[PDB]
Amino acid sequence: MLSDEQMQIINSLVEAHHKTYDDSYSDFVRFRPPVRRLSMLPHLADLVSYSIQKVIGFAKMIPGFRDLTAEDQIALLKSSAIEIIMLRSNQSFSLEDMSWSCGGPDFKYCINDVTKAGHTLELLEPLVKFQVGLKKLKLHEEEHVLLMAICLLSPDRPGVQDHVRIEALQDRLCDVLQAYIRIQHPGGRLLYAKMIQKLADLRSLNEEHSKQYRSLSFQPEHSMQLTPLVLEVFGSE
Template identity: 35%
Template sequence: MSKEMEELSPLGDSGHGDGSEEETEEDDEPKICQVCGDKSTGYHFNAMTCEGCKGFFRRAMKRPAQLCCPFQNACVITKSNRRQCQSCRLQKCLSIGMKRELIMSDEAVEKRRMQIRRKRMQEEPVMLSPQQEAVIQELVAAHRKTFDMTCTQFIQFRPLDRDQKSMSENSREPKSDKSYTNMYKPPPEEAIQRTFSFSSLSSPSSSPQSLESKERKWLKSAIFTSLPHFADLTTYMIKNIINFGKTLPMFRALIIEDQISLLKGATFEIILIHFNMFFNEVSGIWECGPLQYCLDDAMRAGFQRHLLDPMMNFHYTLRKLHLHEEEYVLMQAISLFSPDRPGVTHHSEIDRNQETLAVTLKTYIEAKRSEPDKHLLYPKIMACLTEMRTMNEEYTKQVLKIQDIQPDVSPLLLEIISKDG
């Protein structure tokens, strides 16, 4: 900022009064600056001055160099010539009673600026920009176009077989959705700790080696009755996610290799987000239109506890945030545009897209939420995104294990989790 602009700036230390209103005499005539005769804006550093002389005095007192008059130390300071002799102007400031000790430090001035900005932000409601509104509308439209929230397609998949005979002897699952729902309604804390058919594998006394051996034996002896249904379900979900990405202009603008890398990296995470929309945090059941799923259905598809336990925790944590549809779709878009996925080449472009989406999510929360603790929602969502990343690798490992034992995994899923292009 130039000296001339700084002199015109109303922000600064006044030393007396706030300088926000013009001081006037009783006859409504404006007061004048006691230094140069210009129009005064109030008391600054203990004297009636204009903004220009206020700024000059503050700078002069912070300046280490001595000022010298080029004339006879008797210059008459006026509005028109006040910049010609800094020495006499400073002497005039001191002679009318301006005090150096009333000048605020740079730290205090910055603190005051921050307070003013904060006050303005509190007074002015946060609004989504037209560009952010357009991004949200685009994402919601893409989501609704590519994913049917009624889940009517699910009944066309191969049946979800819950035949107890195909499980180990410890299974206690009832055969029907209705009886399961009526019987199983524990609180979330108990639901997370549910006992699975293979719970004996994870006893505290089991060593990692014996646990892995028992797990392999269990996997080989089990018949994964839910796997055909889950294979169809996964194929359906992956196709929706691919179509979701292809619907977004910012995704289509990427090179095809990066599109593939992003889809491979984000598919599992977006499936989790989709299913969280159906999760009942009271019963621990996914209520997907005509069908209901419990955690043991995933176990009957071959998935194991060290994936299912953190996955269940994740669903309770995210569902308790009670996200809006807009927040869900922004969350899945942030997951999709992750520049650190394996195989990504144009990192900076994807990073810019992700930053735009993250800022849009944060602004949406500030603009649309009214809860007193709404400022905590954004970091909680970001923590859930991080948690999904930690489960992604374990999910891939378990899918490959299941495929080795019972080759009924979706070919499209195998392509998604493959490490080659």
């Protein structure tokens, strides 16, 4: 049976996600509009830039993130951002559609639209297989949110200094996750292990994105099309 301290963590993680995930998708009209081989790069870069802001808002509300150094916060965000976007995107991914349903018809993102932004199938087929694998797990929102926080709070990320502190935060998150599953998730005896496997999936999707981002950012007529926040978060700087 879950303690009150563990209960508050869940509450604040859920409240943090609800503040930073807009289910109405009404900001998407602000982006440079989509065009349907680089036709989608302006739109999708505005999209990822918006998502990065939501992830920074999310992270700032994880218990104990605010209290890390600014350097540790930046390092954790620069290596995890792309993984939390892929993870948080599961709530609009559709098994029937194989697409991300983000509101109106202009923001239904098929696999065709998403191959038009500089990245290749070596990134996009695994990412799609990840989405259906993760959808099929049918996570409670509490579990989904716990996983985002565990993913962000990984100490085995390049640049982190206070390893032991970040590791203690993540450990207490994992305890809550395993306990929640055992007690509140029927038939979830294997689910903790699968979720941790999906975190490994995420590491691999990260490397392939970083490798391909490198090729975009070395072409100044492409990186020109990104946003300042993307250039800063995905930069090597």
